[PDB]
Symmetry: C2
Subunit: 329 residues, 2 copies
């Protein structure tokens, strides 16, 4: 039922958006069909982890028949707002590595996907008292993500270098770039639609979102480097891109002067042998052993904070538990 | 006083945004100074026609000393919201024609400039009852502009060609791509802050914005083709880019079969002689003569609609008159 409901609401949102363009924005059929296809290509095909989390939080916060169906429908629209926001970031990422009409159309896609999050909210929640708070929290999270993208993209530089290759800075990147929109926003949106936002300790929730985000990114960084492309589903480029990865920051705290010198001379290069030298350094430093322990300690902290949350918000803690299970898998 | 006030409020908005990043978003000084410079580079140096229009509308809608200073301050924040929105579109346009950290930073700039319009509104208008309506009208205008950009960029194609080279389609492009954010939005924002939105006939106002936008774009299209780069302040590329320009649509309605064939074989090419052949065709078709008459007829329509607006909204009509004078110049 969650996925079937989420897909039914997608059809409803899509039809509203496309009919609105046709009827109110003077759009010709050819462009309407082009936007239908673009929306499908960018918004469908994923696991819908962010979107489905909104639904799971709302269902749990049942602790009137008209109120239930409304809360679940609202959870679905909120879920598609995040899925469209994710679709917008991925398009922006695709421009970041690609009279060129394809580049013009990609920038346009980026702008429409973001505008669509506002359009679907302004319509489906038009009479809801939470509309203003929802829009403000969503916009603030969107800004946070762009800020996180700045921290990430400039980690190996000085915007106006391994100085920012620290665990505390790695955590700042993860929090802003990933954790706020991937873990915190779905949880918060599920709380907003349920009208149960002040009934939860936001501090413990924020802390949980940051911890789950960190667990996910450390695993993502390790997989980027060691999981082969056929198993990973993409080509891992963190070494070549000189990313501030969990592997790089952990390696620098335990490598010798000569090993650090060897790491510095081989990091951030496309050359196959330099990338392999970095992989060799990570392996020889027993980073895979340190990976297991780091993740286990984060897992212990997550498991503990859910209990503190369950003391005042029991239903919410079970939805945070399922969100965690999706990450820990 | 308007420009001095507008610049004073810029310093105030900038300081709030940058202090917020430092204090609430964990930003390091190096990145704060980098964003201060980027904000200055992208947001300052223009004529501030959109921003100053908001101020001019609010001053006029004076037909309590605490209310005046608030309305004028609000007009300034709204003006900077549009100037930042304009800055965001220009950055997006710069990406449209340019491990590349400059492209990553340009995309990031685009995203921050837009997010800043929301951040400054959410702060300065936090307790205002118009905040929700202002955000919704601004977001709807932003979407309209992205839609207009789609109509523009794909005018010479079929997104899934001279069929869309018509006066009615030219007007659809101008309305969505330019008129809504350049002429309608500054007028509407000046009305919102003054709490005088329902006291005006929106139909006549929308019609005026569309007409002024059209007058401006026809002149812009003619200047792009005939005004030399040292006088224009840029290199005119409409012919090379095969734009749906006022010159192209007017030429196609009056050219002979052989001349249309000659236009079709030479339009949309970078080759210097093909561009010159297009310029020769426009000249020989007496498009400069038709330009004068087209603009004069639009001017007559503008002058007439301001009178209808003055019947119910006198102060507003004088601000629409000054906005027109800035375009007619
Ligand atoms: O869905 C994604 O894009 C990434 C992802 C992989 S496991 C997991 C668990 C929870 C959330 Cl919110 C996201 C993810
Ligand atoms: O300011 C710009 O970017 C373009 C422009 C030139 S004359 C004029 C008059 C009114 C408005 Cl709103 C804009 C313009």
């Amino acid at each position: 039922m969650p996925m079937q409901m989420f897909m039914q609401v997608y059809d409803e949102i899509q039809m509203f958006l496309l009919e609105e363009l046709e009827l109110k924005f003077d759009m010709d059929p050819n462009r309407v069909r082009y936007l239908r296809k673009m929306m499908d290509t960018t918004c469908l095909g994923g696991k819908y982890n962010r979107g489905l989390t909104v639904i799971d939080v709302a269902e749990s916060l049942l602790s009137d028949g008209a109120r239930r169906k409304r809360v679940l429908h609202d959870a679905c629209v909120c879920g598609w707002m995040i899925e469209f926001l994710q679709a917008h970031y991925l398009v922006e990422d695709d421009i970041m590595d690609n009279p060129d009409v394809t580049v013009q159309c990609a920038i346009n896609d980026g702008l429409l996907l973001k505008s669509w999050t506002h359009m679907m909210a302004m319509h489906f929640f038009a009479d809801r008292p939470f509309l203003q708070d929802l829009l403000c929290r969503f916009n603030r999270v969107d800004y946070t993500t762009a800020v996180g993208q700045l921290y990430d993209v400039t980690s190996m530089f000085d915007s106006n270098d391994f100085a920012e290759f620290t665990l505390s800075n790695y955590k700042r990147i993860v929090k802003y770039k990933t954790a706020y929109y991937t873990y915190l926003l779905p949880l918060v949106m599920g709380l907003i639609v349920s009208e149960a936002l002040p009934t939860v300790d936001m501090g413990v929730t924020e802390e949980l979102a940051m911890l789950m985000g960190e667990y996910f990114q450390v695993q993502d960084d390790v997989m980027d480097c060691f999981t082969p492309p056929e198993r990973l589903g993409k080509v891992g480029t963190d070494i070549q891109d000189a990313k501030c990865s969990w592997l790089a920051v952990t390696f620098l705290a335990k490598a010798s002067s000569a090993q650090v010198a060897e790491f510095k001379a081989n990091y951030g290069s496309g050359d196959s042998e330099k990338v392999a030298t970095v992989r060799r350094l990570y392996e020889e430093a027993d980073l895979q052993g340190d990976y297991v322990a780091y993740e286990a300690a984060v897992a212990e902290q997550v498991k503990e904070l859910i209990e503190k949350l369950r003391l005042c918000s029991p239903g919410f803690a079970a939805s945070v538990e399922t969100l965690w299970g999706k990450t820990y898998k």
